[PDB]
Write a protein that binds this ligand. Structure first.
Ligand SMILES: *[C@@H]1O[C@H](CO[C@@H]2O[C@@H](C)[C@@H](O)[C@@H](O)[C@@H]2O)[C@@H](O[C@@H]2O[C@H](CO)[C@@H](O)[C@H](O)[C@H]2NC(C)=O)[C@H](O[C@@H]2O[C@@H](C)[C@@H](O)[C@@H](O)[C@@H]2O)[C@H]1NC(C)=O
Ligand SMILES: *[C@@H]1O[C@H](CO[C@@H]2O[C@@H](C)[C@@H](O)[C@@H](O)[C@@H]2O)[C@@H](O[C@@H]2O[C@H](CO)[C@@H](O)[C@H](O)[C@H]2NC(C)=O)[C@H](O[C@@H]2O[C@@H](C)[C@@H](O)[C@@H](O)[C@@H]2O)[C@H]1NC(C)=O
Ligand SMILES: *[C@@H]1O[C@H](CO[C@@H]2O[C@@H](C)[C@@H](O)[C@@H](O)[C@@H]2O)[C@@H](O[C@@H]2O[C@H](CO)[C@@H](O)[C@H](O)[C@H]2NC(C)=O)[C@H](O[C@@H]2O[C@@H](C)[C@@H](O)[C@@H](O)[C@@H]2O)[C@H]1NC(C)=O
Lengths: 152, 144, 152, 143, 150, 144
């Protein structure tokens, strides 16, 4: 069983801060094989074996209050320990203002190759620049952090 | 044969442990037997309230916080209770069609009074928000 | 190596299952042993169980000047699997911008994630349109793609 | 080099030990040396097949009656230009000011200039209609 | 293993081939043996044949407040050019509004069969008004690939 | 004597060459020692100008070309200098709020002249772009 993982976000409400993740592999859409594990206190995924990984996350939102809510939402992947500059993965999804043509969901996907060593911690932070934030929520099961090792 | 077929609802057939069936993890459920995973429970937060809580065999169900109503099967999204001049349709709040009115929150559009049927004039025309105001007969001294 | 990539034959925006090219002689199409396309049921069949990185992408173009608006979605259906886990294992919506002076004449979306596929599992893609003047938009030929490779 | 001048209509088959295999159906390879064939273009909906695909060349589309091609390779279709409009290389554009087109699928023509034989403009023109000339400005019609 | 990730050097929206950072001593850039970067032709060169997962992403930021609109497209080209683009992405630049959407992003990946010696170029095309008002986000326009089989 | 702690700012601990220190590649920097890679230097082009060039140790700083000014931290965006009727605020150029004015490029909003304070009338009301024009005392022969 090669080194790979996929976590489904627990959060529904748009609040700035670290996302909490489902990590039990018995849950549909969640896989945590090898020596990989999840630190629930710090909300970080800890890497099992060193290598280069294809790391990706997915961001899907649904309008939960009809006719309300607009702005944008952002995810950032943070590595622990850190170089000094930048974030490893950044994805911004715009929420369309409510209109007759506007749909009530929004989606964004981004993927990257990342150097990860064993014992490295990966956290994701949610940021929101939205008006009437209550009108949008994270689509349950569709905000996902995944990674698999490409150096076999 | 296949031992996963005997894992009941509330468990899943665990390919990660030595045991064959494991109870659903927290905040999850399996509504049928013989599943390889359990499904993450629906969470009802913000505008949503928890009408029925999640169990190991049954998904939670949401409704909308007071002053809002559900829209869509399974209460997919919430909508403010319709105001004066609209009525609730399956696709949300909709203006009253021409000739009908609704004067109150959470009402239904109904046609205007036809004063002409009772032989009365129209002093003030209605809108989607208000009924007509009929006057006296046209013949009545009010009309010269 | 265990991978497949199919290119959709479909051109017209119609609700229903997409049909796919499966001959590796064609550009964009490759398959290994253990992955095969059943033409009569429009499904990609996986032979070996495992975890796969599965992705699809959807590109549309405006074919009638000045017309067309709405949205188009793709859903990956897994069979056999309960509806909760396999109905929308992969789902993506793209919006058709109305014809405007901006003259935005194409739309694009991409999604990927890790799925556990069982031996004999069959992958199908359903196309759904909520659009006005559907004749005015078409799938860009060669740019509607379903791909996957086993991570293990 | 391998696959060197695999003839048009074939592709260098990585699966048949790099023999030049014939292109699969609905594909073509207009050049030599290709390791795959390209999928033939389809002309459906508003498009019609002008030229059919072959093993050596792609199909070519045109537009269904009532529309005309717009892009370089007929990349989209546009409804036939109406009165007040002229078909350009970039689609139906409105007639330049001072000119007109009063018929569907027509070319813009400049307005009649009434002043050339000393006449007057009674009704001005638009993009859709020519001016209407009247009597001389000094005619008693105008007082 | 066999993989590479290049980070674009360009920031200004100009029609033509993108130039790439390729030294793996930089954050975000990696290049194993069997893949190399030819600087004069701005091409990534594959040395060992196989099927790779190739992906690139395009991120743009508005650098002039209240200005700039249109679209920007990336295209991955194989030379041996034969006689189409292997990957093709078009990202739309929102007009300036009070809603203030000042970034634009696109991502595409797919499986590509590459032969020994295959060279990869990425070309940038702009169809924008006031293109000075938009720029490539530095470190966020990325082209990556890794081998899948063998 | 941890090897990577031997590499100071301006180099990185090359994990491709067995923990030797290598100088930062061209157009990069490392602001602390012991980093395993250097980060690409910020470029300042187009509407941007280089305020401080980057070194092996420090990142480059951008400012905006004349006629524009920086918006946001680190000069992440440029904005044309504010014209008459506006004032430069942290969020950009903003109209003078009602009762104030600025009549020049790159100015600040000042309050209108209170004509009533000096016992004078108002001949022309001000705007965000111009000060009011006061007149003679209302009891003057100017006024009937
Ligand atoms: C009362 O209002 C009617 C208007 O109907 C619609 O609903 C209103 C809330 C408003 O939005 C209005 O714009 C709408 O048209 C009138 O009947 C309508 O009259 C218009 C104008 O001729 C006509 O286009 C509509 O078809 C017609 N409705 C129907 C169902 O046919 C009432 O009477 C009109 O006014 C008279 C002067 C005369 O034109 C008569 O033929 C019209 O019916 C309005 N009544 C009064 C007393 O104002
Ligand atoms: C007849 O229409 C001409 C067409 O030009 C119009 O320009 C716009 C103003 C608009 O009305 C549009 O629909 C037309 O395409 C007029 O010529 C224009 O006149 C305007 C004056 O407002 C002038 O600015 C334009 O440059 C001029 N266009 C051209 C191509 O010359 C005619 O106006 C007559 O000419 C003027 C010089 C002036 O003498 C005016 O009093 C005249 O009526 C229109 N003439 C008549 C008799 O209707
Ligand atoms: C001069 O203008 C003042 C502010 O005008 C506001 O901004 C302008 C750009 C314009 O759009 C105007 O309509 C705006 O209201 C006036 O004071 C304001 O007047 C409005 C009138 O409804 C009132 O609601 C505001 O509270 C008031 N603001 C303050 C701080 O007092 C000046 O006086 C007004 O106009 C006079 C004719 C008189 O009726 C006075 O009572 C009004 O307040 C303007 N002075 C003039 C015109 O001499």
């Amino acid at each position: 069983q090669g080194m790979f993982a996929q976590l489904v976000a627990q959060n529904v409400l748009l609040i700035d801060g670290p996302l909490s993740w489902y990590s039990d592999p018995g849950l549909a859409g969640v896989s945590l094989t090898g020596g990989l594990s999840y630190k629930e206190d710090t909300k970080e995924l800890v890497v099992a074996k060193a290598g280069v990984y294809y790391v990706f996350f997915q961001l899907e939102l649904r309008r939960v209050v009809a006719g309300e809510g607009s702005g944008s939402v952002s995810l950032a992947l943070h590595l622990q320990p850190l170089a000094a500059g930048a974030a490893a993965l950044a994805l911004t999804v715009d929420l369309p203002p409510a209109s007759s043509e506007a749909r009530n969901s929004a989606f964004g996907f981004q993927g990257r190759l990342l150097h990860l060593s064993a014992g490295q911690r990966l956290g994701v932070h949610l940021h929101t620049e939205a008006r009437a934030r209550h009108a949008w929520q994270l689509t349950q099961g569709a905000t996902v952090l995944g990674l698999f090792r490409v150096t076999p | 044969q296949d031992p996963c077929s005997n894992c009941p609802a509330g468990t899943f057939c665990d390919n990660n442990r030595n045991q064959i069936c494991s109870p659903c993890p927290p905040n999850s459920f399996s509504s049928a037997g013989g599943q390889r995973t359990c499904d993450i429970c629906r969470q009802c937060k913000g505008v949503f309230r928890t009408r029925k809580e999640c169990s190991s065999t049954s998904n939670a169900e949401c409704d909308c916080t007071p002053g809002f109503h559900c829209l869509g099967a399974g209460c997919s999204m919430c909508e403010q209770d319709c105001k004066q001049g609209q009525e609730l349709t399956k696709k949300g709040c909709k203006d009253c069609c021409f000739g009908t009115f609704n004067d109150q929150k959470r009402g239904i559009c109904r046609p205007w009074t036809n004063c002409s049927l009772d032989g009365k004039s129209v002093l003030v025309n209605g809108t989607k928000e208000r009924d007509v105001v009929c006057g006296p007969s046209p013949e009545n001294l009010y009309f010269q």
